[PDB]
Design an enzyme around this catalytic site. Structure first.
Site, PDB file in Angstrom:
ATOM      1  N   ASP A  75       0.879  -1.178   0.000  1.00  0.00           N
ATOM      2  CA  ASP A  75       0.000   0.000   0.000  1.00  0.00           C
ATOM      3  C   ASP A  75       0.915   1.226   0.000  1.00  0.00           C
ATOM      4  O   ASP A  75       1.842   1.268  -0.826  1.00  0.00           O
ATOM      5  CB  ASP A  75      -0.992  -0.127   1.156  1.00  0.00           C
ATOM      6  CG  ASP A  75      -1.934   1.029   1.225  1.00  0.00           C
ATOM      7  OD1 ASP A  75      -2.943   1.003   0.485  1.00  0.00           O
ATOM      8  OD2 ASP A  75      -1.653   1.967   2.009  1.00  0.00           O
TER       9      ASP A  75
ATOM     10  N   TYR B  74     -12.033   8.946  -2.512  1.00  0.00           N
ATOM     11  CA  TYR B  74     -11.830   9.096  -1.072  1.00  0.00           C
ATOM     12  C   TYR B  74     -10.605   9.944  -0.725  1.00  0.00           C
ATOM     13  O   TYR B  74     -10.548  10.510   0.370  1.00  0.00           O
ATOM     14  CB  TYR B  74     -11.698   7.720  -0.417  1.00  0.00           C
ATOM     15  CG  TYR B  74     -10.441   6.972  -0.821  1.00  0.00           C
ATOM     16  CD1 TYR B  74     -10.381   6.263  -2.021  1.00  0.00           C
ATOM     17  CD2 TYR B  74      -9.310   6.980  -0.001  1.00  0.00           C
ATOM     18  CE1 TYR B  74      -9.238   5.580  -2.393  1.00  0.00           C
ATOM     19  CE2 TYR B  74      -8.153   6.295  -0.366  1.00  0.00           C
ATOM     20  CZ  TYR B  74      -8.127   5.598  -1.556  1.00  0.00           C
ATOM     21  OH  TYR B  74      -6.985   4.926  -1.908  1.00  0.00           O
TER      22      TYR B  74
ATOM     23  N   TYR C 208      -1.320  11.325   2.427  1.00  0.00           N
ATOM     24  CA  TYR C 208      -2.104  11.725   1.257  1.00  0.00           C
ATOM     25  C   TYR C 208      -2.068  13.218   0.976  1.00  0.00           C
ATOM     26  O   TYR C 208      -2.581  13.644  -0.064  1.00  0.00           O
ATOM     27  CB  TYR C 208      -3.578  11.375   1.428  1.00  0.00           C
ATOM     28  CG  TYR C 208      -3.902   9.933   1.635  1.00  0.00           C
ATOM     29  CD1 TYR C 208      -4.284   9.128   0.563  1.00  0.00           C
ATOM     30  CD2 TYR C 208      -3.873   9.379   2.910  1.00  0.00           C
ATOM     31  CE1 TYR C 208      -4.604   7.802   0.753  1.00  0.00           C
ATOM     32  CE2 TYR C 208      -4.188   8.062   3.113  1.00  0.00           C
ATOM     33  CZ  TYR C 208      -4.556   7.274   2.032  1.00  0.00           C
ATOM     34  OH  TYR C 208      -4.880   5.962   2.234  1.00  0.00           O
TER      35      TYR C 208
ATOM     36  N   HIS D 264      -7.563  -6.224  -0.464  1.00  0.00           N
ATOM     37  CA  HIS D 264      -6.557  -5.209  -0.189  1.00  0.00           C
ATOM     38  C   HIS D 264      -5.627  -5.574   0.964  1.00  0.00           C
ATOM     39  O   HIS D 264      -4.456  -5.181   0.946  1.00  0.00           O
ATOM     40  CB  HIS D 264      -7.206  -3.870   0.131  1.00  0.00           C
ATOM     41  CG  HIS D 264      -6.197  -2.792   0.413  1.00  0.00           C
ATOM     42  ND1 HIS D 264      -5.407  -2.245  -0.578  1.00  0.00           N
ATOM     43  CD2 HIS D 264      -5.823  -2.190   1.569  1.00  0.00           C
ATOM     44  CE1 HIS D 264      -4.604  -1.340  -0.047  1.00  0.00           C
ATOM     45  NE2 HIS D 264      -4.841  -1.282   1.252  1.00  0.00           N
TER      46      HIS D 264
END
Ligand SMILES: CC(C)S(=O)(=O)N1CCC2(CC1)C[C@@H](NC(=O)NCc1ccc(OC(F)(F)F)cc1)CCO2
Ligand SMILES: CC(C)S(=O)(=O)N1CCC2(CC1)C[C@@H](NC(=O)NCc1ccc(OC(F)(F)F)cc1)CCO2
Ligand SMILES: [Mg+2]
Ligand SMILES: [Mg+2]
Lengths: 319, 319
Positions: B107, B155, B238, B296
């Site tokens: 990830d 998202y 992010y 995931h």
């Protein structure tokens, strides 16, 4: 030789018992080498060996031994007998997922690594001691009889009663370490007169000079470390003579069959080189190093010769 | 497969910057393998790989990435751009005295290890990513344009404004992790509808069920870890899209020449396998693994297949 800044090290912690964590410093990759200091020292006592062994291709783990520095200091005196100390080191290897490691000790740490090699050979790839010889337990002679018989071991009687030596060692920490950490020619203490004079330092300067071996900064690091738990934990390593003797007797006869190195120091007047003279009879693959002009504080007295002896022996016998 | 009890691990800490320490867990001996988790996870997310890789003869270091768990969480948003995160990992290797290491990420951690391999190949013996593909920066397309173009990345807009997603993620930590950590067939979230509904969890149970992947105990470990610093630090990964894009552009053209493994997960509906389809053009020695029926949360979804793929690839390409 390159030294260590304590703040730039990787710090590791392992819980080996409910209220007992061991702290170590870690550097390098390759076969695991565990370094075990003596009394009253620190992982930092290996500051000259740690970057050298790592640059030679070893993974170095420099312990704070139990009682010292950032490792736990349990209050009970029998938590510091060799039997418990060795079984905790085995748990240490277990929690780190290491099948075996090279053990290198000095002084009390050298005592510890001999007994690791004796009782846990399967976990010890190779063993080296600085200054501390391996003498098999004499089952017909008590530890107290064996002390009175070496007048130089007299200070260990002064260390016996809880509270007494703590008070002298802790009263001026900078004086304590400046008085202990000296080359042999600069020495201000007579370990063979300690119990009648009434103390280690009764007859040595109030403000001692700085030995050529150490800086003021290095002294202050030891001072700050021993402010954490004091001298009780370290002194308890001497307060288990009968237990250690009984345990050591349970091993009688058996030899140490793993690769081994005994390094003697010409001017160590407590752990004299002659105390090692018949280790070959018990340790058949034993190799030797000897360092001239070197007192008790071998790693900081003669770090370049120590590094050469250790790297030469690790490359030929431990790898 | 064997898991990990957190209290029986060796814990390590390295200061890489004045107020930034990274925490990791360490197990085994052999070549050093560094494992980098994703959002919002933990060193513990590797609990099934850590004893397996160590038993296969590797020295495993499972990071708490910056912002997470016991690692420091600096308050500044730009402390979490890929440029700083990678340069801290290099400092991490330096302070550990490691010339190079195998990096395995998942990830966001997979994103990190690709950029380590790209900008610090000399420090990376080999690189593996789970789920996260390596896509070279498009210098003619901004990150905001690249998101609006994948409706599933919607998202990440909700994650942008400091404070907003923190409130939802931190309001009921057990609900957060029970809602996220699920197999694909048990999934209760639609990442492609998050910004208009107004939140990740607005349309999912109040008291969600326990996924077949996890226990209540494992859930509570994640809960207790995120109580320490909350979700700000993790969410800041992010919040540096423009910085990361600019930095990634500075590399354009160059290929990754070191041994590499891309592992895709059939049922990861965010990081879909097809996003990896032309990595060969940039990574010429790239090998592949693919895991069917895997969502995931690859390490805990399919730990046995992950362990097999990783050990097979480490033995042939990293050693
Ligand atoms: C003999 C039996 C009673 S024993 O078998 O029980 N036994 C053996 C001998 C023994 C203890 C146990 C000594 C231990 N080490 C120290 O005590 N170090 C302190 C020290 C401080 C200053 C100093 O400075 C100098 F004087 F200038 F040189 C020198 C030494 C290591 C393990 O072994
Ligand atoms: C695309 C550009 C904007 S980007 O280039 O900036 N870019 C690429 C894509 C990106 C971010 C940056 C995704 C990152 N990972 C996550 O965000 N994980 C969260 C998560 C949670 C739950 C979940 O559950 C499920 F939905 F059921 F599957 C799935 C995923 C890893 C790094 O890369
Ligand atoms: Mg003989
Ligand atoms: Mg192609």
């Amino acid at each position: 030789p390159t030294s260590c800044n304590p703040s730039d090290m990787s710090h590791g912690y392992v819980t080996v018992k409910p209220r007992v964590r061991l702290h170590f410093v870690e550097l390098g990759s390759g076969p695991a080498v565990c370094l075990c200091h003596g009394f009253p020292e620190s992982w930092y006592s290996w500051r000259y060996q740690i970057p050298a062994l790592a640059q030679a291709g070893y993974r170095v783990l420099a312990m704070d031994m139990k009682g010292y520095g950032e490792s736990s200091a349990p209050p009970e005196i029998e938590e510091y007998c060799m039997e418990v100390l060795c079984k905790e080191m085995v748990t240490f290897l277990d929690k780190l997922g290491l099948s075996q490691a090279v053990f290198i000790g000095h002084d009390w740490g050298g005592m510890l690594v001999w007994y690791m090699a004796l009782f846990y050979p399967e976990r010890v790839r190779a063993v080296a001691s600085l200054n501390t010889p391996f003498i098999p337990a004499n089952p017909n002679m008590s530890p107290l009889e064996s002390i009175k018989a070496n007048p130089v071991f007299d200070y260990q009687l002064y260390f016996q009663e809880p509270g007494v030596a703590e008070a002298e060692l802790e009263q001026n920490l900078s004086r304590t370490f400046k008085s202990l950490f000296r080359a042999s020619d600069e020495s201000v203490l007579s370990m063979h007169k300690v119990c009648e004079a009434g103390g280690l330092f009764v007859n040595s300067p109030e403000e001692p000079s700085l030995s050529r071996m150490v800086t003021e900064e290095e002294i202050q690091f030891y001072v700050q470390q021993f402010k954490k738990s004091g001298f009780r934990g370290p002194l308890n390593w001497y307060r288990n003579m009968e237990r250690n003797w009984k345990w050591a007797c349970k091993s009688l006869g058996r030899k140490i069959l793993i690769p081994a190195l005994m390094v003697t120091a010409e001017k160590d007047f407590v752990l004299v080189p002659q105390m090692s003279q018949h280790m070959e009879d018990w340790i058949p693959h034993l190799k030797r190093g000897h360092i001239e002009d070197c007192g008790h504080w071998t790693q900081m007295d003669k770090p370049t010769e120590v590094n050469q002896i250790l790297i030469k022996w690790l490359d030929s016998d431990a790898r």
